[PDB]
Amino acid sequence: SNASDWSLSQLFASLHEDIQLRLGTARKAFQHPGAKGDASEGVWIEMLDTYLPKRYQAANAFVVDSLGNFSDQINVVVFDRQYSPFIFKFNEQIIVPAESVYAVFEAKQSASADLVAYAQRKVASVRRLHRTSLPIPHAGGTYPAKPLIPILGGLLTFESDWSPALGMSFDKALNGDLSDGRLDMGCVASHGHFYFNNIDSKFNFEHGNKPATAFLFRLIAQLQFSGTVPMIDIDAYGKWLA
Amino acid sequence: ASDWSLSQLFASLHEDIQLRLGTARKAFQHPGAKGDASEGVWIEMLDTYLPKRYQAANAFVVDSLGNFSDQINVVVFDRQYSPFIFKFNEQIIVPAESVYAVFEAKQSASADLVAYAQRKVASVRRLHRTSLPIPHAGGTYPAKPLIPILGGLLTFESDWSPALGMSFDKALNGDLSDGRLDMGCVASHGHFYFNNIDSKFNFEHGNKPATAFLFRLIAQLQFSGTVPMIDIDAYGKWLA
Amino acid sequence: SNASDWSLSQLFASLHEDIQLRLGTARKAFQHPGAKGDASEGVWIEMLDTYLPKRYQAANAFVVDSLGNFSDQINVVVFDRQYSPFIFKFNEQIIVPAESVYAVFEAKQSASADLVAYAQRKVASVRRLHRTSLPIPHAGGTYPAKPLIPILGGLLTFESDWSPALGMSFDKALNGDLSDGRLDMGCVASHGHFYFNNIDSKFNFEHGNKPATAFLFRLIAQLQFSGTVPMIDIDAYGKWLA
Amino acid sequence: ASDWSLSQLFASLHEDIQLRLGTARKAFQHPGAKGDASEGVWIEMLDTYLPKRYQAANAFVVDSLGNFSDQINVVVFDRQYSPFIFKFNEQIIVPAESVYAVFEAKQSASADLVAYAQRKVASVRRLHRTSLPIPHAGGTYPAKPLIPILGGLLTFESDWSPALGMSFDKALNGDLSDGRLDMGCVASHGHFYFNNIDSKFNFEHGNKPATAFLFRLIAQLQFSGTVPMIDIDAYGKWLA
Amino acid sequence: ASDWSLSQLFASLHEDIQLRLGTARKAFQHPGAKGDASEGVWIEMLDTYLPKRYQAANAFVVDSLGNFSDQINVVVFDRQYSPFIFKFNEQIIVPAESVYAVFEAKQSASADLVAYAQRKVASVRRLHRTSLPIPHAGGTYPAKPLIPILGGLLTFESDWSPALGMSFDKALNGDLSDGRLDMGCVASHGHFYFNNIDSKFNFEHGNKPATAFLFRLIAQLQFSGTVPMIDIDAYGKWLA
Amino acid sequence: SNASDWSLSQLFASLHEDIQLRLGTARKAFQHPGAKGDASEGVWIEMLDTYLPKRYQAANAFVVDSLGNFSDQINVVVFDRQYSPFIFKFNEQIIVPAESVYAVFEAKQSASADLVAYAQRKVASVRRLHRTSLPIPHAGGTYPAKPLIPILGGLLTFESDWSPALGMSFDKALNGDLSDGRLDMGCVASHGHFYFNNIDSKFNFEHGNKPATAFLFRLIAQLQFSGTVPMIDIDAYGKWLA
Numbered sequence A, C, F: 001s002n003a004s005d006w007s008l009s010q011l012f013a014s015l016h017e018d019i020q021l022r023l024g025t026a027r028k029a030f031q032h033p034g035a036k037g038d039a040s041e042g043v044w045i046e047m048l049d050t051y052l053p054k055r056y057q058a059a060n061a062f063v064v065d066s067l068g069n070f071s072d073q074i075n076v077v078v079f080d081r082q083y084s085p086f087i088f089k090f091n092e093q094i095i096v097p098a099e100s101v102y103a104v105f106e107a108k109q110s111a112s113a114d115l116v117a118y119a120q121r122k123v124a125s126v127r128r129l130h131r132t133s134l135p136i137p138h139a140g141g142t143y144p145a146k147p148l149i150p151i152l153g154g155l156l157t158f159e160s161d162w163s164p165a166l167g168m169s170f171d172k173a174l175n176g177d178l179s180d181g182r183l184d185m186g187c188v189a190s191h192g193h194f195y196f197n198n199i200d201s202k203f204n205f206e207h208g209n210k211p212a213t214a215f216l217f218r219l220i221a222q223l224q225f226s227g228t229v230p231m232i233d234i235d236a237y238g239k240w241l242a
Numbered sequence B, D, E: 001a002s003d004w005s006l007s008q009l010f011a012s013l014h015e016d017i018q019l020r021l022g023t024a025r026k027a028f029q030h031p032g033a034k035g036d037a038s039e040g041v042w043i044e045m046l047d048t049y050l051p052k053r054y055q056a057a058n059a060f061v062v063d064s065l066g067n068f069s070d071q072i073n074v075v076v077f078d079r080q081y082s083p084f085i086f087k088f089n090e091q092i093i094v095p096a097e098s099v100y101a102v103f104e105a106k107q108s109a110s111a112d113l114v115a116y117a118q119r120k121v122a123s124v125r126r127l128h129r130t131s132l133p134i135p136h137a138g139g140t141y142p143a144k145p146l147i148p149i150l151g152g153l154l155t156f157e158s159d160w161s162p163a164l165g166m167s168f169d170k171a172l173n174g175d176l177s178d179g180r181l182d183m184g185c186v187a188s189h190g191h192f193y194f195n196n197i198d199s200k201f202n203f204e205h206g207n208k209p210a211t212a213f214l215f216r217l218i219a220q221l222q223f224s225g226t227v228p229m230i231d232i233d234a235y236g237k238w239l240a
């Protein structure tokens, strides 16, 4: 028909449906574990690359600090490049400084106790890294060194192994690490999303209502509180030239 | 999903097309934006999967006698051996000699839209194509006899119920001369093709419609070989 | 000859001449109204994409707000992406949030009373949209919510239907809408450019002297006063997930 | 460096490869990242220098009977006349008919790795390839007889000392049937190839190993011509 | 502008070239920048409009005997069947066997510049080209006889008055052996070509000079077919 | 072997080694002076493009000011585009306004007295240009016009003609221009890097220890002090439209 009545809700439905279908395809079509994970990770990266404000980069990377310590391989890193160098780039492979990182996510097919714990360990391998912070020159003078921003951590999946998908067993797993490995938010594309409520100090689950889009908006809103990364002391890295 | 499956690959290829065409239709509540969205999905499928000897894009077609076609939603054409006649940023005008196939892409099949597609196909087939003797590694071939230009219709849905039944067949039999459609796809239901042996249209229901259409197009295009060799000096008569 | 004497004026002449010739070509070469408009719009977009500071994006888009209302299709939107998400992106087609918008232009072949009124209606369809604004975290603390920036509106053409091209009839048309649809500036590539003088509350016309380049500089200088877009409340959009 | 020198150009082509492969091995202290880095260096060399009739990428290969290969580090394949079977962002599945050559890329040659490469090559050679009569400007060629698929091994180093000596030769003679390697490169030491006339493997030491391998590959590929013409309707049997 | 017009399309193609070449000359008051600007306009025209079997770029040319050409402003060459000899970011060295045509691009025609272009063309024509028997779908062709390399001169203006008259003709007749120019374009005035039948140069005034040159180039290139098949092992003699 | 022990020092070695090898290749492979310089310049540009924070652009360009004066051709300009237009762009060739410039470098094959003096003259041709600066609108109000930032100047080479490479003769050459043409830093890829110590008012040479990486870090750290470019008065350029 020729009817035209724009709908904002429909836009958010279509955004989510695209993610859910492509994650489902990645899982069904690729029977090789490496290709299946690469395909699924790429769906989440594309969503963040498309929709996050351009102050954020989203990519697979290793994180390193000025003490020479390295993270594990991080499936989805959200990081700064406006004010931050790469530490190393070789074709498409990148190593980013800890000071550039805003958020880190583990992307896997289905939520489980083992996967939640794995993600907690990945997040901890980043949060343990040392971050420098220098006084910041700007048009109005020099700000004090910015206090270190929280690094957001999370878990991105297509499905849940639990029944109900987002139930007490998922909550138990999330409460397994409330310190260096704490997961601030995550998405189960087929079911809902979760986030840590700092005021109540508990995890909240939200069912349905366009899970990937709801996760994306939660991430944008929480990232706003972080502002920009602190200003890196590249000369701390330079101690390793000799 | 225990093991690799060709059937699953072809299902996923098709499901991506069907879902994105449905998104284009639902999300863009503006006629121009909706058509642009849907056309781009079909063009992307062809760009991704057709052999690289084929280009696929929106274009006008023109011949060396100054006859211009209507704007064509989906033109499949050669660029390995053919120039553009004109390009201005994204807008292109191709010579008739470069064309392999022409498709109209719309939301839902109907008698009016089948007729519209038939007229668009005829408008390109009625253009004059030159053909020169072809130099090659072994010498010079005689001028290639002109290749048929394939035509068709690509939609998401059908206005008819049943979707791919007698009313659709009647519409397709409305032009059996130079607007005859060779093949088409209704992403939500199936695909169709002209059966030259039986001189009738055939419908195939389900069974991964976009992928089935894609394969039919590749197989039929192979019979055309490469485009005939253009006489660019015929176009050059318009320089004076 | 081998003489070399750099000229800044010549650079600005060549910038303008390129625009004027390509707009003329778009009009003469494409006898299909859709292709002709697409070709001309693309010339103006390319100029802004090439020369505007990179804090600005320039593209064709629809604008939407957190109340679910949509603008008309806008030929040339100047908007932020450094701090603003897309609301929806499908291949190259984009829907931007009202909070991201700096300026909106209608691009057509020739100025007339009807086209000026059409442009006024397009601009109004954007300015009527609701824009959120949150307190802004930054390295020095938190700014108050930024007061909403003006959205600049205008009209970009190749020719003028009036004789003289930029005369009292054009002025009359511009004075038709001094509120939601007011056109702050515009360019008639073959003749000159116009702008609203806020202090005198009248429209000023400038004839010749490299019209497209003069328009570009006027736009850059006026955009500087807007600073960056206010900070979007993405959770206002999130009310439409349920 | 008084004047232009072909030898210097070929030395610089090789030195770039050797240094970047060494960087990949040293810098990336993670097995997945290290392999990705090294594979990308070899793919970039082929992408840069092979004739554009050849594509080079990581891919799975599948045939029209549903047989799938293992993941292949470096596939050299046609896209001018061949579709993808499936593409999802960077991941691709190509039809067996499109394949010209397959290589395994690893850090250092060893008996286990030579055997691994032989098995990978056999896995692709054992796939079924269709071949149809080929329309062209002069008519229709008979179906092209199937082209050999070239196979090999690409490494930075050798675990053996001497690097390219009798132990390497013994490993290469471990598969003289459908896993036989045609050529390979050890960037730090030399290259090897199967000599069909003498029915033995030959090693060439130094003398710009990556460039020498590149040239051997180009020359050998020329004998294959273009891939046979795929029967996409054989794959279409999996639509139902 | 009531209706579509081929003449208008060809006028707009030419006017874009003429205006951009004039901008390059006026705006860039530095000899290196001015030449880079103008050369890029001509390369862009060829990149946009020539059939994709042709590449167009600035390059050096080298042969398998180690003879190097001067730097060539505009080389038209094959990459479908030909490797690069060397590539380092934007700088390329192509094998003589890949070359279809060579042009010098400058601001204004003059006796010195016509002679300069003749010498540049001769420098490429004097390089040795290999040619091997060519495998193809039907078998193996004999080695292709060597194709002529087309040469010419591309400028914005002419220093002579009249621009394209007897003095220009005299300069063109200064080299009728291996520096002979086949065609060229003076964007502000017309184009020229060697008439093999009459063994004389012909000038065409106005009538969309860049477009006329483009069409002449396409038509003449078609007679060359594809480049002969390179013997990369001839270059490989320089590995040792 | 299967050992995995990440090393930050190795990353910095590999970054430098890539630069040193590619500069050596440019010098050896291209026997045409224009191609050789284009090849070498491109190596340095790629390093800065890859690793500098994205607030910086790096390219070959001419610089112009609002008085109509032009610099010489600058091999490597580091400049802003987030807040600054191009003055002219024609295919890949660019002319940037003086207000956009952060740093300028001359890139050549081997350091010598003549090359140091040439670089000093190039840097002076940029520093002599006039830069405007306007009060800066931002989310917190309007900053005063930013005082003009120093433009960093330098010299980038593969080799040194002197023996020792970085000795008293190099120091003498650097002390030849301590004003408009002063070179703040530079790199001799095969030997080390140098920088001007403002506190001691002397040049310091650092030998080995990954020269290109050490230069890159020195540049990043010094650029941080400059903050962002002052805000351009595009209407000063607009005086040349008439």
Ligand SMILES: [Cl-]
Binding pocket: B119, B122, B123, B126
């Ligand atoms: Cl018709």
Ligand SMILES: [Cl-]
Binding pocket: D119, D122, D123, D126
């Ligand atoms: Cl097997």
Ligand SMILES: [Cl-]
Binding pocket: E119, E122, E123, E126
């Ligand atoms: Cl010569």
